[PDB]
Amino acid sequence: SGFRKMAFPSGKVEGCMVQVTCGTTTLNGLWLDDVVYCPRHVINPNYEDLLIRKSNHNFLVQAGNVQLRVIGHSMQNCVLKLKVDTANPKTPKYKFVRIQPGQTFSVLACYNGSPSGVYQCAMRPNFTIKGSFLNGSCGSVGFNIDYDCVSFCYMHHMELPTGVHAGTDLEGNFYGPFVDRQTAQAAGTDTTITVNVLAWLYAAVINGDRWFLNRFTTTLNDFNLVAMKYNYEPLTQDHVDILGPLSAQTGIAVLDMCASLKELLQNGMNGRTILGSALLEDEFTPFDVVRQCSGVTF
Amino acid sequence: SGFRKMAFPSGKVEGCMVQVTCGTTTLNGLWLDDVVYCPRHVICTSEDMLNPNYEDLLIRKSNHNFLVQAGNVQLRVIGHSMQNCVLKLKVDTANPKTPKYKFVRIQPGQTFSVLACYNGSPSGVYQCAMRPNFTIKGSFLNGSCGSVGFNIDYDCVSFCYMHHMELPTGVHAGTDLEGNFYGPFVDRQTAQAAGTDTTITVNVLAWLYAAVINGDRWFLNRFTTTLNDFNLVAMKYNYEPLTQDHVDILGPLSAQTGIAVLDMCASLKELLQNGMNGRTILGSALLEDEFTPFDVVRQCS
Ligand SMILES: CNC(=O)CN1Cc2ccc(Cl)cc2[C@H](C(=O)Nc2cncc3ccccc23)C1
Ligand SMILES: CNC(=O)CN1Cc2ccc(Cl)cc2[C@H](C(=O)Nc2cncc3ccccc23)C1
Ligand SMILES: [Cl-]
DSSP states (O other), X not given: OOOOOOBXXXXXXXXXXXXEEETTEEEEEEEETTEEEEEGGGOOOOHHXXXXXXXXXXXXXXXXXXXXXXXXXXXXTTXXXXXXXXXXXXXXXXXXXXXXXXXXXXXXXXXXXXXEEEEEEXXXXXXXXXXXOOTTOTTOEEEEEETTEEEEEEXXXXXXXXXXXEEEOTXXXXXXXXXXXXXXXXXXXXXXXXXXXXXXXXXXXXXXOOTTOOSOOOOHHHHHHHHHHTTBOOOOHHHHHHTHHHHHHHTOOHHHHHHHHHHHHXXXXXXXXXXXXXXXXXXXXXXXXXXXXXXXXX | OOOOOOBOOOHHHHTTEEEEEETTEEEEEEEETTEEEEEGGGGOOTTTTSSOOHHHXXXXXXXXXEEXXXXXXXXXXXXXXXXXXXXXEEESSOOTTOOEEEEOOOOTTOEEEEEEEETTEEEEEEEEEOOTTSOXXXXXXXXXXXXXXXXXXXXXXXXXXXXXXEOTTSOEEEEOTTSOBSSSOOSSOSSOOOOOOOBOHHHHHHHHHHHHHTTOOTTOOSOOOOHHHHHHHHHTTTBOOOOHHHHHHTHHHHHHHTOOHHHHHHHHHHHHHHOOTXXXXXXXXXXXXXXXXXXXXXXXX
């Protein structure tokens, strides 16, 4: 019993965190094999013009108390790739993956190449992450661990004026219509990840919380007409299919659980809580619920 | 900016997790130097749990009855001793991944990270607090026994909790790393229940100061209170009494934000009376109590 916002064990990622310094700027890098990946803003910025003026020795890379020597440098989209002399012996089995909004991941927040904390979070429908970052956190990474393979999905780049965060995948492509520079940019209006709220309602049922269940059902179209009114993401047939295992385990059909959500949106919680929360939680996917309520290890 | 329930990086602890098997029972162990620490109930059967005589069950065991697995390698047990509710298995290999560490006993209200493990394999990490009733509201399934709670301050891992059991309300009970339980609990399947739980007042205040640091002042008011009047009110909401030590501990946050502790107490008194009125504080519709004054300074500064 119990339900917590749980992150993947960060150990395999901690062994990859390095400090990258270029001039006055200091941020984090991800050292995998003989390459260090970091945000290109470490160097209206023309990044080809600023980079062509740099030599290998202008980049100081520190792995613990050891300085790594940069032997080459190249740019791929908004990530700087620093070729180093030493291959990281702690390099885990890994992939670079690009996630979709609604998908969750773990963030190992670092300052000066040192990991300070780990938290779980979701890619919002507006492509931002509601993270906890201070200056110096740039280059911190987001990941999922699947079996023994670390799938790197996020690299932190900047903070938006509303306090939310923006970053790229490990190939340097931003999530969202953001650019790496000081200019007027704002996060779009956010929506609730409906499939995740439903997964969390199924997690509550598994943990013994059933007060919100009702005898009713709904059509997918009627549910979406109500979801659109409450700034909830449209629920698709794929979402319904993905919730199948949870539906079969608890005996509550997805459209039956949708009618409970319809009632919660129109009427509120009435002084009650679900899994110790007075708000409808949307940062646990259907897979996170199955993994936590079944105990999968890495 | 931003405020998250943040756990310590688990790497230094992952390198210590081993699987301990005794007969039919399999649970987790903490391998530090040449010793593996695990719950002593690993020597028990399910029947033994009502009234187990651990000294009697342990005297019948030999070193080779305990199977310890570190990754894909079996460790050889060369000795065994019991210290309170923990079994200490002396092994023939010192863990090369042993970090710099201490065994610390925490007080209620203190927070720590939990690396939840099954079969000696870490599956997840989360943050939690020692509740005033000495339980932890964790997320554990069968096989998680032996999972540990810790804090990492500088390069030193302070082990403060080892998981032993789930109480009937779904909450969890365990011991410090010297085998002394937190609370009036015993490693017996007896009728035991958690005492009435209360809110950790000093932590809610620390979290209100975190919200002020992040730009949220909507809940502040023009009032102050005496410590005694605050406690008379807070007790009616099942909030832990706030002591002068708590007030002293909140001093740095008070000085940083410019809001006196008793002024912030007046805001809390008003929030308990009115509720939030459709509003949130740091993305929460409830008053958060699992961030200490130390956690707030660490995450915001
Ligand atoms: C709010 N940001 C600033 O005033 C300065 N910033 C301007 C800027 C512009 C473009 C790009 Cl790509 C990066 C940055 C830098 C930036 O966003 N880094 C930060 C990252 N995460 C949390 C941060 C909390 C606080 C400060 C800075 C953070 C630095
Ligand atoms: C609810 N517990 C049971 O039915 C069986 N239990 C009885 C018992 C009694 C005393 C002691 Cl010290 C340990 C245990 C064992 C126990 O509590 N382990 C578990 C730990 N954490 C989460 C657990 C979720 C589910 C099951 C078991 C968990 C095993
Ligand atoms: Cl303490």
